[PDB]
Amino acid sequence: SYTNSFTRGVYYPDKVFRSSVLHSTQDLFLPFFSNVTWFHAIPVLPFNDGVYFASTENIIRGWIFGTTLDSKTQSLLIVNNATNVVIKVCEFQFCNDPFLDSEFRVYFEYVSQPFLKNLREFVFKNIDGYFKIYSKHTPILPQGFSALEPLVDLPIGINITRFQTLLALHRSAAYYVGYLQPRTFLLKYNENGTITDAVDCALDPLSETKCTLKSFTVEKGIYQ
């Protein structure tokens, strides 16, 4: 199916601190009111740039990146097992419909805390030979606004062209995928430094007017 990302998809572009000052940044971002695909499975997705990943819940698992998914180019293999995160950068014999049980029927080591009604928001940027992961979990695409903070950076320096998703099957399902586009926003911080509200810069004439005066309150008058 199809749905619309209302206002989510905003993250800290840098590791700086700002206190209640309206600042403008230009990075690879998710446009507001865009066309995010609601993929469902009981697949092969292109990766032109970073992607926006979101799901609700435990059969949803890790992810697989790469250029071709072959035995000639390194492919990211990020998996979770409810206690650890495993990253492998090698070449594997990928299959068409991979899943986990734990037998490995799917076919640079970093182990940390696992990321896992709650809503989770993941974005996977790729720029200048890096691989940055951003995570946030929120309770109640339902409406609302929240930030998105980085937790881990992976220096790999490989080209990524494809994107997949792993599942867990019991023997004895719904995730949103969006695409990033190059445009700018205008971010308003607060006293504690977290992002409170964001505005698009090229979405609407009023939004562009807010972008070109660096404020949220636009007084009565004519502006160029």
Added chain:
Amino acid sequence: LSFELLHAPATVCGPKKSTNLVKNKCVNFNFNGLTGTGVLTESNKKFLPFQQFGRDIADTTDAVRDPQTLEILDITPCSFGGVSVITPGTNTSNQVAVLY
């Protein structure tokens, strides 16, 4: 041993000679590659635990976090400013007064 180039950004190299700390003094520093000169002062802000340093409205580095501890140190420039000389005419006298 054989060294390799042009595969990835650099990810292995040794110690960088960490030094001690000074407070309430106009010294120059190098905090995670962020150079600058100022007075190191204890801060009262509340950083999020993923941000290396901070700026202000004037786009200058005023708050920095040392990678050894979890505390944050404010950056304020040390004493600067012009000097002016108060004097009468040299035909009158040679007494002068200095203003900062």
Added chain:
Amino acid sequence: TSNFRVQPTESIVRFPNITNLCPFDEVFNATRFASVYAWNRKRISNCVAD
């Protein structure tokens, strides 16, 4: 007439803790070694090259 500024006194350089060492301490100090025909090349990355 001029500008008055105070000169810096001393220089401090700050960097994080020196952790996550390589197995250099055991590739030079091991139990045994492989022969010249079947040597064991070891990948070295992501550690402190002290």
Added chain:
Amino acid sequence: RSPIEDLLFNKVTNGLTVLPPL
């Protein structure tokens, strides 16, 4: 401060020094 003066006064909010007025 006169009340008119007070009402007026309450309605007005590196290398760059600001000299105070005489």
Added chain:
Amino acid sequence: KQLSSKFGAISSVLNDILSRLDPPEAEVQIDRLITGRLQSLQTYVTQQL
């Protein structure tokens, strides 16, 4: 705000350019930075006048 402008140079920090590039290219980069900042200062002085 003009202090954080690259002005066509590699970076906007005087200490970064001098301790990373060779002096033949550092001369050109610093000269570009100085002429940009001097043009900004002249514009501000004219506006103030």
